[PDB]
Amino acid sequence: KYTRFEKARIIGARALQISMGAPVLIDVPPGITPLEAAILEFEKGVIPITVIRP
């Protein structure tokens, strides 16, 4: 389904959003870094960003 480029782009967008102040959509262990938070949200399936394909 997802190409690795799309996955990397989605995770990079989510991590930047979380760092800039967006709330996390899933509970996370304390002390985690925003990139790992985005990766956790991803493998848990809670992604609010969709990809446009022609």
Partner 1 sequence: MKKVIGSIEFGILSPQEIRKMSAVEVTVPDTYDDDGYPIEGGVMDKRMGVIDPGLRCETCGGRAGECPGHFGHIELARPVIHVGFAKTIYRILESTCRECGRIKLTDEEIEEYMKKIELARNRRSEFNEIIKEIHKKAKERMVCPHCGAPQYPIKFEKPTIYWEIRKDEQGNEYRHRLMPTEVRDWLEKIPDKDLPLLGLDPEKSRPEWMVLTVLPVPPVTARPSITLETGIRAEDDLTHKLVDIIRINNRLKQNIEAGAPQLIIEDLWDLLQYHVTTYINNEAPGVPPAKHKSGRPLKTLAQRLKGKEGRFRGNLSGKRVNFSARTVISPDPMISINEVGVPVEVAMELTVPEKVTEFNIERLRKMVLNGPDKYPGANYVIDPEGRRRRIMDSNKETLANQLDIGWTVERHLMDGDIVLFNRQPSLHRMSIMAHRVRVMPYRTFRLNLAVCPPYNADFDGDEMNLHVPQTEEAQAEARILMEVQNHIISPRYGGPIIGGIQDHISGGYLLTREGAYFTRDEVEQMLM
Partner 2 sequence: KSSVLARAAFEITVQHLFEAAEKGEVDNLNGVIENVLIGQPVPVGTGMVKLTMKLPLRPQ
Partner 3 sequence: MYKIVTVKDVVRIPPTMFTMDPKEAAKIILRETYEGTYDKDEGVILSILEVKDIKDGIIIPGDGATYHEVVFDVLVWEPKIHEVVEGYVADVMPFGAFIRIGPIDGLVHISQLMDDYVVYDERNKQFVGKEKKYLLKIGDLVRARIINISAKSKVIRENRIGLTMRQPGLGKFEWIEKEKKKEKEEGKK
Residues lying near partner 2 in the complex (CB under 8 A) are found at: 5-6, 8-10, 12-13, 22-26, 46, 48-52
Q: Could you tell me the smallest distance in angstroms from the CB atom of residue 36 to partner 1? A: 8
Q: Give 10 or 38: the residue with its C-beta nearer to partner 2.
A: 10
End-to-end CA distance of the chain: 15
Tokens of 26: 């899933």
Burial of 9 (0-12, 13-18, 19+ CB in 10 A): middle
Give residues in contact with partner 3 (CB under 8 A): 13, 16-17, 20-23, 49
